[PDB]
Structure 1
Amino acid sequence: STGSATTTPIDSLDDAYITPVQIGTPAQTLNLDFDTGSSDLWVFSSETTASEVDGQTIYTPSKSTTAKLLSGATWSISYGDGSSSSGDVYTDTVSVGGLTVTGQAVESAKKVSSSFTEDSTIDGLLGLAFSTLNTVSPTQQKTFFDNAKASLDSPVFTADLGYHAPGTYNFGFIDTTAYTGSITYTAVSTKQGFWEWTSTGYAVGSGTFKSTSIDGIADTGTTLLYLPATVVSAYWAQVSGAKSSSSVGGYVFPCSATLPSFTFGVGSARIVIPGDYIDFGPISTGSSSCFGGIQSSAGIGINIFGDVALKAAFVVFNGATTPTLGFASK
């Protein structure tokens, strides 16, 4: 089997991407944030505290003839930005882009933090990291991809995120028309539960490539590119007036700037992030200070190849017995 679904930016800045997911019988379609940095499929639901729901579409398990309470199971998650959610668990039928899993754990939120409530465009998360990170207790549950894997034509999924435009998540096949050149594959460590890999270096604009190992994670659920402070300083030094602002929480730059590209290495191959992908717009409405898309990972404890990086590539998440990642230009 295979599946293919379009993923759409939630706003004009690509602050996140949403993909429609069918849950239950009859189907209830929710728009979920596909997140290769976490491993829980959780949704706003009829159980979510009413004051914490503001415009999201909810899953109502009592209206699904295939939903079953997973007795005694609870979940609770915190994300890198300080947001959180928690609740109980059902199993139900879940379909993405025509690919169906029966008995998928659907984690129903009883509580969500303010950043979820305040974002009416995201109805939940669909985790695509390794199932070892799943938070369900006392019986850890499998991700949608792990449940689907054996049925897929090939044990892979691909992320093809758009810049200020829709893109595609495919399951079970590699669309050879969706990229240019060849796909370069690189080793993955699953020891922290992530799609963790080592980039071979970077370049800023037309500058020379610096060969240096940068360990980090391929994370579709993180908006920006978080890299070591040395690398990030080298990038923003090429932008007149750019500075790190403690009050704003990272590097900002004059909105009048034209930004240089940023290149990262995948083995001997190179992925070029165009400068415009690094512009996240005014820090507040009407400001001429703009927020940068490349930020320091210092204090986060891991480097994160988030959407800013991944949207410049066609990315293969190869879930073979020894997982690997593939990157192609597009």
Structure 2
Amino acid sequence: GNTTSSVILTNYMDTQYYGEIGIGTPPQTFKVVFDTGSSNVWVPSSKCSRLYTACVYHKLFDASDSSSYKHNGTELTLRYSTGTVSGFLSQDIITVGGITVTQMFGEVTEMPALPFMLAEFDGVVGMGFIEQAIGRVTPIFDNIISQGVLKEDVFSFYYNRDSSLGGQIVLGGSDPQHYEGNFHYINLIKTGVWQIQMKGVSVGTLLCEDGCLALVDTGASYISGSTSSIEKLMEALGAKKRLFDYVVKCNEGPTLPDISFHLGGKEYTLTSADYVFQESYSSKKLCTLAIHAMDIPPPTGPTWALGATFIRKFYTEFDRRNNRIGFALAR
């Protein structure tokens, strides 16, 4: 087909990027993260007990208000790094960027207050492959592709730094307004995962010396590595570990070295301004780093993950026809 389509994103505090989709007839609207690190669509459900406080604070999908709903009921549990959601399968028409698609998705009935009370978004639209879909449920982008409307079998992510357009996902191509220079492509190394070979992580190559893996994860806020790798990285930066993050004396933030990720021959460099939440310059304040430990079990990991920290600097094209990821300088 001839169409490309776009989804406008909201940037909450540089940590959460999400857009709007519609589900059902008439459309019920949900804030959703578009997540290349997972493959299932889910939203919180009206059948979620309100003893889950996360279900009191998010928009709930009521299948009883949709005339296009089709029951399935297969129970599924989706295990993420920071928490788990559980529910049952449903089918309805989903509207994303003005493209309409019949889509199987999860109605979440069990949604833990931590971490999900911290989510601005209601749910997740997985942009991954059918291979990592729980229940082998056909992902939304595979269903969009089956319509033959998209110009290209690709989608692209722009995450703005400004917290104005928060971001943009192009379905069926890319947007030249939000990148510059050439794309550099790295082909995927594992079946059904948006994952690439990484050849080194430099700090001012201290880590990933004999190669490692990098997941390009649009649904993650930060750059992550294994607890071991990050502990080494953070010793090199002089950062202190806390419960859920690494921090430095805010005055030390602008003195911190460049972090470089060796991907497909090129070096992808983040400066301190790219990975330090510089909320103060005080020696008596602590400043959080957009880099945390996240141990990912096999078969996906151990692996680094490149989240919004990375994507903010590098406009990312996800190419399904040629199984590759393209990076260009974001503008």
Are the counterparts in 1 of residues 81 and 294 from structure 2 also a CA contact under 8 Å? Answer: no
Measured in 2, the distance between the counterparts of 1:100 and 1:232 equals 45
CA distance, structure 2, for counterparts of residue 33 and residue 115 of structure 1: 17
**1:134 maps to which residue?**
133
SS at structure 2 position matched to 1:222: coil
| Alignment-derived partner of residue 314 in structure 2 | 313
2:303 is matched by which residue type in structure 1? I
- Taking the aligned partners of 2:293 and 2:121, their CA distance within structure 1 comes to 26
Shift of the alpha carbon at 1:281?
6.6
Identity among equivalent positions (%) equals: 25
CA distance in 1, matches of 2:231, 2:324: 26
Give how far 1:141 is off. Answer: 0.9
Q: Distance in 2 between matches of 1:37 and 1:120?
A: 17
Q: In 2 relative to 1, CA 125–40 (structure 1 residues): closer, same or farther, beyond 3 Å?
A: same
How far apart, CA to CA, are the structure 2 residues paired with 1:215 and 1:269? Answer: 15
Q: Report the alpha carbon displacement of residue 236 of structure 1 after superposing the two structures with TM.
A: 5.5
Distance across 1 between alignment mates of 2:22 and 2:296: 38
Q: Which amino acid aligns with 1:48?
A: C
The answer for the alignment partner of 1:163 in structure 2 is: 161
Whether the 8 Å CA contact 1:271–1:329 is kept in 2: the answer is: no
Aligned residues: 310
Matched with 1:325 is 325
Of the candidates 144, 147, 150, which is equivalent to residue 143 of structure 2?
147
Please list every run of at least 4 consecutive aligned residues from structure 1 whose deviation after the TM superposition is greater than 6 angstroms: 208-211
Task: Give TM-score scaled by structure 1 length.
Answer: 0.85
Match of 1:302 in 2: 303
Please say if 1:85 is aligned against 2:85: yes
1:276 aligns with 2:273: yes
The structural deviation recorded for 1:202 is: 4.0
Pairing of 1:1-330 with structure 2 (within 5 A) = 1-10=3-12, 12=13, 14-52=14-52, 53-70=55-72, 72-81=73-82, 83-101=83-101, 103-119=102-118, 121-136=120-135, 140-150=136-146, 151=148, 152-165=150-163, 166-191=166-191, 193-204=192-203, 207=204, 212=209, 213-227=211-225, 229=228, 233-234=232-233, 237=236, 239=237, 242-245=238-241, 247-257=242-252, 258=254, 259-280=256-277, 288-296=285-293, 301-320=302-321, 322-330=322-330
Cα separation, 2, equivalents of 1:266 and 1:184: 9
Partner SS state of residue 46, structure 2:
coil
- Whether contact under 8 Å (2:260, 2:270) holds in the other structure is yes
> Do the aligned partners of residues 162 and 232 (structure 1) sit closer, same or farther apart at CA in structure 2, a change above 3 Å counting?
farther
Cα distance in 2, alignment partners of residues 18 and 225 from structure 1:
18
CA distance in 2, matches of 1:59, 1:67: 11
Q: Structure 1 residues 244 and 250, CA, compared in 2 at 3 Å: closer, same or farther? A: farther
Q: Distance in 1 between matches of 2:224 and 2:119?
A: 26
Contact 1:272 / 1:312 at 8 angstroms: preserved in 2? no
How many Å apart are 1:2 and its aligned residue?
2.5
1:57 is paired with a residue whose SS is coil
Write out per-residue CA displacement over residues 73-118 of structure 1, whole angstroms, 9 at most, x where no aligned residue: 221111112x1111112211112112221x2012111111122541
Between the aligned partners of 2:229 and 2:132, the Cα distance in structure 1 is 30
Q: Secondary structure at the match of 2:179?
A: coil
Q: Report the TM-score, using the length of structure 2 for normalisation.
A: 0.84
2-side partners of 1:297 and 1:123: how far apart?
22
